[PDB]
Amino acid sequence: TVSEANALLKWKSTFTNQTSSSKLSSWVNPNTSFCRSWYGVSCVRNSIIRLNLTNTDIEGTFQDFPFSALPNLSYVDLSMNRFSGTIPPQFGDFSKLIYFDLSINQLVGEIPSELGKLSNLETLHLVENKLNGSIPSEIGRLTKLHEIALYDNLLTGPIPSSFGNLTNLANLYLFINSLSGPIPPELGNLSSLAELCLDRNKLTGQIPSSFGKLKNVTLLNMFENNLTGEIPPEIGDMSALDTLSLHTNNLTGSIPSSLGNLKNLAILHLYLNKLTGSIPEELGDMETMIDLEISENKLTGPVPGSFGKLTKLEWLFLRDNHLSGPIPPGIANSSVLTVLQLDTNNFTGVLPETICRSGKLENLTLDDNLLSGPIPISLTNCKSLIRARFKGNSFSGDISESFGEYPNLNFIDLSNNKFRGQISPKWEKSRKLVAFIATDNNITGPIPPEIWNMTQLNQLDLSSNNISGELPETISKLTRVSKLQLNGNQLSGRIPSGIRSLANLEYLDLSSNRFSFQIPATLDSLPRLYYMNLSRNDLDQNIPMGLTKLSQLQTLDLSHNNLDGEIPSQFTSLQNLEKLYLQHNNLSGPIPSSFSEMKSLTHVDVSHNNLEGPIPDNAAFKNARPDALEGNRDLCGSNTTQGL
Numbered sequence: 001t002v003s004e005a006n007a008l009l010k011w012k013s014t015f016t017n018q019t020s021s022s023k024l025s026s027w028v029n030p031n032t033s034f035c036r037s038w039y040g041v042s043c044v045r046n047s048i049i050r051l052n053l054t055n056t057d058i059e060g061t062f063q064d065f066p067f068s069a070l071p072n073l074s075y076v077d078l079s080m081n082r083f084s085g086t087i088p089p090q091f092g093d094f095s096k097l098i099y100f101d102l103s104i105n106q107l108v109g110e111i112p113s114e115l116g117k118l119s120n121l122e123t124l125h126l127v128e129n130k131l132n133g134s135i136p137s138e139i140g141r142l143t144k145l146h147e148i149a150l151y152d153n154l155l156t157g158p159i160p161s162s163f164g165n166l167t168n169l170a171n172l173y174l175f176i177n178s179l180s181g182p183i184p185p186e187l188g189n190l191s192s193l194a195e196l197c198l199d200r201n202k203l204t205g206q207i208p209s210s211f212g213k214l215k216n217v218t219l220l221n222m223f224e225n226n227l228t229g230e231i232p233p234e235i236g237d238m239s240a241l242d243t244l245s246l247h248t249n250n251l252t253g254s255i256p257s258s259l260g261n262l263k264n265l266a267i268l269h270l271y272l273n274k275l276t277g278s279i280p281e282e283l284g285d286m287e288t289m290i291d292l293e294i295s296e297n298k299l300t301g302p303v304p305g306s307f308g309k310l311t312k313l314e315w316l317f318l319r320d321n322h323l324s325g326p327i328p329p330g331i332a333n334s335s336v337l338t339v340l341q342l343d344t345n346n347f348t349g350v351l352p353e354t355i356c357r358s359g360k361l362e363n364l365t366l367d368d369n370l371l372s373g374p375i376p377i378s379l380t381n382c383k384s385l386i387r388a389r390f391k392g393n394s395f396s397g398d399i400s401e402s403f404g405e406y407p408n409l410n411f412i413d414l415s416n417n418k419f420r421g422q423i424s425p426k427w428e429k430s431r432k433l434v435a436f437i438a439t440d441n442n443i444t445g446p447i448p449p450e451i452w453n454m455t456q457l458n459q460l461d462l463s464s465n466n467i468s469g470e471l472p473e474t475i476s477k478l479t480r481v482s483k484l485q486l487n488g489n490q491l492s493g494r495i496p497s498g499i500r501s502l503a504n505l506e507y508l509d510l511s512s513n514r515f516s517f518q519i520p521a522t523l524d525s526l527p528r529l530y531y532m533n534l535s536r537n538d539l540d541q542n543i544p545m546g547l548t549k550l551s552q553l554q555t556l557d558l559s560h561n562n563l564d565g566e567i568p569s570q571f572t573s574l575q576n577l578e579k580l581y582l583q584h585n586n587l588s589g590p591i592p593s594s595f596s597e598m599k600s601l602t603h604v605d606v607s608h609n610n611l612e613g614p615i616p617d618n619a620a621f622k623n624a625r626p627d628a629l630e631g632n633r634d635l636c637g638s639n640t641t642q643g644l
């Protein structure tokens with residue numbers, strides 16, 4: 001003991017970057033107070049049995065640790081320190097050791113197989129180091145082990161089959177590592193196992209069919225491995241399971257119907273695999289299921305109608321599969337279902353009337369299916385909606401009657417459907433709505449002016465519809481819009497000057513419309529605008545000077561209009577202009593030949609204009625095709641179509 005105190009002092013004397021304020025200040029007077037006042041030291045019969053120096057800012061190694069001098073150690077916690085070097089084999093010499101923790105440290109090298117000498121060890125903790133090499137097989141000798149945690153290391157090789165001999169192991173955590181090879185089937189002998197976490201490794205091979213003997217495992221995390229084969233139906237015999245996560249693997253075959261026998265399973269993660277076949281209707285018998293995610297697979301056929309029996313279902317992720325048939329009503333019938341994502345499948349028919357029956361549905365994704373028919377009325381009145389995506393379907397109906405007021409709506413996408421009718425002012429009640437996308441529908445009538453009062457709107461896409469009327473100057477109220485797409489409609493009259501005020505505008509498209517008269521001379525106040533498409537309109541007269549004061553333009557398309565006069569020399573301030581399309585206008589005069597100053601002009605079309613003179617000195621004019629430069633009155637100094 002005084003010998004133990006002296007030995008520990010010699011070890012302390014090797015620590016580096018220590019401070020006067022370190023808790024090891026109490027290591028004084030070895031002859032009298034080793035067992036009564038030394039921090040981290042506790043004794044029985046005046047001999048140290050417990051060394052607990054966790055989180056004491058110790059920087060050092062275990063090279064000079066006095067293994068020989070502390071024979072009676074049974075509790076060693078040296079975690080959360082700055083220990084470096086390796087774990088010496090002499091740690092296996094502490095024959096009374098029960099608890100061993102060296103976890104949050106900077107240790108390197110392999111685990112000494114001599115740890116298998118620690119026959120009294122019940123807890124082994126070495127997490128969050130840089131330990132490499134294979135896990136020693138002799139660790140399977142430690143039959144009193146209750147818990148092994150080796151996660152967040154650089155361990156390689158297979159899990160030793162000897163671990164099947166650890167009949168008292170409750171928790172096996174090995175997750176953040178590079179463990180390899182097949183999972184040893186002997187793990188099925190761990191009858192006391194409760195938590196098995198092998199996730200985030202490089203495990204290959206099949207899931208052992210012996211896993212069905214693990215009747216006390218509640219958490220089986222094996223996600224983010226390279227497991228192949230099919231999910232063995234024996235997994236359905238792990239009756240105590242509440243969390244089964246096998247996602248991000250290379251599993252194949254069908255989902256075993258035996259999963260329906262897991263009456264305690266609340267979380268099932270099977271996504272990001274290559275599962276095929278139909279979803280067994282028995283999967284509706286997992287009465288406890290909360291969070292069911294089998295998305296991103298190759299599942300086919302219909303979703304079983306028996307899903308109506310999953311009364312605790314909250315999250316259902318079936319996106320990116322090949323599911324077919326109509327969506328059965330039981331799929332949305334859970335009173336607590338808040339997320340129902342079905343997008344990127346082959347669902348047909350109309351939406352079931354059960355969609356928002358409880359008024360709790362929040363996120364609904366249906367993108368890229370073959371669905372049709374009208375919006376069910378419980379969805380029209382789903383006041384709890386937050387995110388609704390319908391893009392790429394054949395939904396039909398009066399858009400004003402099909403959608404109620406959605407006060408919690410954040411994101412809605414109606415793109416690529418057959419919606420008719422006029423945009424209702426009801427959308428202004430969505431005061432949190434940031435994006436409203438309705439491209440490629442049969443919307444008609446005017447844009448209600450309430451839309452411009454939606455100052456929170458970040459993205460507005462009404463493109464490719466049959467919307468008409470003149471845009472009012474109150475459009476300026478869309479303070480925070482950054483993507484504005486009204487192209488492909490029959491909007492008429494002058495472009496409102498008020499677009500000047502949309503300071504956050506980045507991408508503006510008013511092309512393919514019936515806007516007439518001069519482009520607003522005032523339109524020079526969009527410093528974030530990198531894209532402006534005014535093409536295919538009825539705009540006339542000289543190109544306004546204001547456009548040249550917008551700095552960040554990358555693409556500018558004013559083609560297919562009746563603009564006349566000369567191209568401004570004062571384009572020079574568009575040093576970031578890359579693509580410039582001015583074809584099919586009535587522009588005149590010479591190109592200023594200050595376009596040599598323009599660095600980034602690569603794609604330019606000036607065809608079918610009344611311009612004359614020589615092309616300027618920059619790439620796009622050299623790289624222009626005949627169509628790009630044709631149609632002008634007097635082209636080039638030597639009447640050329642290519643090569644000066």
Ligand SMILES: *[C@@H]1O[C@H](CO[C@@H]2O[C@@H](C)[C@@H](O)[C@@H](O)[C@@H]2O)[C@@H](O[C@@H]2O[C@H](CO)[C@@H](O[C@@H]3O[C@H](CO)[C@@H](O)[C@H](O)[C@@H]3O)[C@H](O)[C@H]2NC(C)=O)[C@H](O)[C@H]1NC(C)=O
Pocket residue numbers: 108109110130132133
């Ligand atoms: C397990 O890891 C050890 C330690 O590796 C060290 O720590 C890791 C976390 C990484 O940061 C490694 O980049 C780092 O080196 C490996 O042992 C180490 O091997 C290297 C080379 O194989 C040794 O470096 C040599 O050192 C001598 C002088 O001492 C030079 O002459 C050489 O040119 C070379 O620089 C290093 O000393 C050694 N460290 C030890 C033994 O503590 C070990 O190979 C690795 N095992 C695996 C990956 O299976």
Ligand SMILES: *[C@@H]1O[C@H](CO)[C@@H](O[C@@H]2O[C@H](CO)[C@@H](O[C@@H]3O[C@H](CO)[C@@H](O)[C@H](O)[C@@H]3O)[C@H](O)[C@H]2NC(C)=O)[C@H](O)[C@H]1NC(C)=O
Pocket residue numbers: 050052054075076077099
């Ligand atoms: C070394 O000293 C530290 C702190 O002085 C000890 O930390 C304590 O460890 C126990 C577990 O042994 C912690 O209790 C646990 O609390 C959670 C809370 O939910 C509970 O669920 C567990 O069942 C367990 O009882 C305790 O909170 C923790 N205290 C602190 C301040 O971190 C450590 O046990 C000592 N180790 C040895 C070997 O002496």
Ligand SMILES: *[C@@H]1O[C@H](CO)[C@@H](O[C@@H]2O[C@H](CO)[C@@H](O[C@@H]3O[C@H](CO)[C@@H](O)[C@H](O)[C@@H]3O)[C@H](O)[C@H]2NC(C)=O)[C@H](O)[C@H]1NC(C)=O
Pocket residue numbers: 487488511512533534535536555556557579581
């Ligand atoms: C600005 O918006 C207009 C739409 O209002 C965009 O027009 C599209 O431009 C391409 C060429 O750039 C068009 O031409 C050709 O169509 C034929 C047949 O489909 C095909 O052979 C060509 O490969 C090319 O696609 C295209 O039809 C046209 N679309 C429409 C609806 O008119 C224009 O591109 C936008 N400007 C910029 C810079 O993006």
Ligand SMILES: *[C@@H]1O[C@H](CO[C@@H]2O[C@@H](C)[C@@H](O)[C@@H](O)[C@@H]2O)[C@@H](O[C@@H]2O[C@H](CO)[C@@H](O)[C@H](O)[C@H]2NC(C)=O)[C@H](O)[C@H]1NC(C)=O
Pocket residue numbers: 562564565586
């Ligand atoms: C294409 O433009 C020519 C050029 O006329 C321009 O008219 C002004 C707006 C201004 O830009 C002038 O500097 C230009 O000359 C049109 O030709 C003119 O047509 C009008 C008849 O409306 C006639 O009085 C003018 O004398 C013409 N000018 C010239 C130079 O010939 C032409 O009609 C336009 N073509 C189309 C299809 O719109």
Ligand SMILES: *[C@@H]1O[C@H](CO)[C@@H](O[C@@H]2O[C@H](CO)[C@@H](O)[C@H](O)[C@H]2NC(C)=O)[C@H](O)[C@H]1NC(C)=O
Pocket residue numbers: 044045046047049071072
């Ligand atoms: C600490 O270790 C020593 C030996 O490493 C133990 O001392 C032995 O105790 C037994 C019975 O108590 C004696 O028969 C031996 O002769 C002792 N050997 C020595 C070298 O002293 C001691 O009991 C241990 N103490 C604790 C609390 O474990």
Ligand SMILES: *[C@@H]1O[C@H](CO)[C@@H](O[C@@H]2O[C@H](CO)[C@@H](O)[C@H](O)[C@H]2NC(C)=O)[C@H](O)[C@H]1NC(C)=O
Pocket residue numbers: 226249250
């Ligand atoms: C297991 O599946 C993963 C899918 O994530 C495969 O990883 C992809 O492999 C291909 C190239 O072979 C590409 O799609 C990507 O480069 C990989 N990563 C992805 C998609 O994130 C992996 O190859 C599969 N292993 C097998 C089949 O043995």
Ligand SMILES: *[C@@H]1O[C@H](CO)[C@@H](O[C@@H]2O[C@H](CO)[C@@H](O)[C@H](O)[C@H]2NC(C)=O)[C@H](O)[C@H]1NC(C)=O
Pocket residue numbers: 339362363386387410411
């Ligand atoms: C449910 O929908 C909400 C709203 O769209 C999602 O949360 C938003 O996610 C975007 C990223 O695409 C963020 O920019 C927003 O800040 C998020 N908003 C909120 C309030 O969190 C949410 O991720 C969706 N959840 C599921 C499971 O689909």
Ligand SMILES: *[C@@H]1O[C@H](CO)[C@@H](O)[C@H](O)[C@H]1NC(C)=O
Pocket residue numbers: 016017
């Ligand atoms: C002590 O800390 C400094 C600062 O982080 C570091 O550069 C040095 O390597 C550490 N060790 C020694 C022995 O100085």
Ligand SMILES: *[C@@H]1O[C@H](CO)[C@@H](O)[C@H](O)[C@H]1NC(C)=O
Pocket residue numbers: 140160161162163165
């Ligand atoms: C498990 O223990 C038994 C006990 O005799 C032994 O025969 C067997 O080889 C052990 N398994 C491994 C993989 O070492």
